Design a protein around this ligand. Structure first.
Ligand code: A1JGO
Ligand code: A1JGO
Ligand code: NA
Lengths: 306, 302
């Protein structure tokens, strides 16, 4: 029992982190087979960032302008290209520690582990969700660009995030590993701000199901709701709409606990109305929305504590 | 910016996790050089676990009764002995991935990363504190025994915890790597319970400093206090006493933010007396006590 924000073991990713330097700018790169992936803004100076012309900046670079360092060893760059907002540096050595991997672009609400890295050296690992407003609430300092987010379902690492920037509200924006930004964000210093964020309803429900599994029933009530009435109330608390897809996805947790999804929705409605009245749910005084239905099944017993 | 419960990268520990099987019991072991460390209760059945005589149970075992699996490979056990509550299985192969390491015993209040494992396969990493009552609020299912806790202090892994049991309140108990329990717990089926826990004051103050560093300032006030007056308030709210050692340890954060420790204690005093009045700190409605001063500096500066 217990319930923790748990990250995937980071070792398969640690073996892929390198340092990339262009000019005076150093950040992190991901070394998979014979390619190093990093944010294209590594090629920018101070001035460049207001209105960078990346094509023009890049055409002026040779391979040997890119210094790649893997632990103690310099890797030799033998090619470069730009894909969307990532630079792909072809190097002369395949990474012998390359894991089984794939690139996946995630949807808002999905969770992943972040390996925070500085100078190509990993510092820490923590669990994050893609917010409805396409930001992440990370922990990142200057030098963290090129840090990656991932899941490891089985022995296969699914890379889903590369860190590019911190927005003015202190939350974080980045790309998939094909270099496409999550959200409306650009790798340019302009006025861009996170949209108003909402709570990830499907995840809160999953976590309520986790609390029941772990032996906790105080917040249930005798009521049900229609989906549309649930969504009319939810939206007033800045909760994301719940779709029929979300109801379907919660089906297994519904079976394990014997509580229908719209009955759990009725419980959530009442929690939003009443608060917790000095109680906690799985150690929290707030409703948690960074555990997915999949994450609850991964972590929780399939025997509920009745 | 941002502040997260952050674990150490687990790679150096992942390469040391193995599966140990004795009879019908399978759990996790730690393979360092040519020794595999695991909980001695691996040798017990259900009935044995009521009143085990470990010395007697062990002397009846042969090396070949211990099946050790490192991924796909069987290791051959060539010796066995016990140190306190851990079993040491001498194997025929040194672990080529053995990191630089030490065994260290931690103090209540200190934090560490846990690599949770099942069948010798690492499943997840999370950050824990050793509670004042010597339990940890882990997340563990059946099969997790022998899962380990660690810190990393350069390239050196400091192993501090091995998981042995879950208590009735759903919290967890274990040993250091020399097999000495944290807390007044024994490896047998008896009635055992977590004692009443307290809040780790020095850690709450550290986290308040983290909040200020991250721009969350609403709880700062014009008042200061003394150690003695603050400690009267702590005791009332089931908080650990704050010592001069604790004040000294918070010194750096005090300098960086320009809030003296006893100034921050005046803030904490007011939070304990008045609550948060609908507000949150670093996204929390509760006061967090599982970040040490070192953890805050590490994350908010390195
Ligand atoms: O935001 C960062 N770079 C800026 C520079 C100028 S405006 C800008 C615009 C686009 C872009 F892709 C990057 C940037 N780096 N970065 C990432 N996490 C950080 C955390 C703390 C401080 C800086 C941090
Ligand atoms: O507590 C556990 N084993 C028992 C067997 C019977 S009484 C007992 C007594 C002492 C001891 F050291 C261990 C044990 N295993 N264990 C560890 N984390 C778990 C999480 C969920 C369920 C069981 C979990
Ligand atoms: Na004050």
């Amino acid at each position: 029992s217990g319930f923790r924000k748990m990250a995937f073991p980071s070792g398969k990713v640690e073996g892929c982190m390198v340092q990339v330097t262009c000019g005076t700018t150093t950040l992190n790169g991901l070394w998979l087979d014979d390619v190093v992936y990093c944010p294209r803004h590594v090629i920018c100076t101070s001035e460049d960032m207001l209105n960078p012309n990346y094509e023009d900046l890049l055409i002026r670079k040779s391979n040997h302008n890119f210094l790649v360092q893997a632990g103690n060893v310099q890797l030799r760059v033998i090619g470069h290209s730009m894909q969307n907002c990532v630079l792909k540096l072809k190097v002369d050595t395949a990474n012998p520690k390359t894991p089984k991997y794939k690139f996946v672009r995630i949807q808002p609400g999905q969770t992943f582990s972040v390996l925070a890295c500085y100078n190509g050296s990993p510092s820490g690992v923590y669990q994050c969700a893609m917010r409805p407003n396409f930001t992440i609430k990370g922990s990142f300092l200057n030098g963290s660009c090129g840090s990656v987010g991932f899941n490891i379902d089985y022995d296969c690492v699914s890379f889903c995030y590369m860190h590019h920037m911190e927005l003015p509200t202190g939350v974080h924006a980045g790309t998939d590993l094909e270099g496409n930004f999550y959200g409306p964000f650009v790798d340019r210093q302009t006025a861009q701000a996170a949209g108003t964020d909402t709570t990830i309803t499907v995840n809160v429900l999953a976590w309520l199901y986790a609390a029941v599994i772990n032996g906790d029933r105080w917040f249930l009530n005798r009521f049900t709701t229609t989906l549309n009435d649930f969504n009319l109330v939810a939206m007033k608390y800045n909760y994301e709409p719940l779709t029929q897809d979300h109801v379907d996805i919660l089906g297994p947790l519904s079976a394990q606990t014997g509580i229908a999804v719209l009955d759990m929705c009725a419980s959530l409605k009442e929690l939003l109305q009443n608060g917790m009245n000095g109680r906690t749910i799985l150690g929290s005084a707030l409703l948690e929305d960074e555990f997915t239905p999949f994450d609850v099944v991964r972590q929780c017993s399939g025997v509920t504590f009745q």
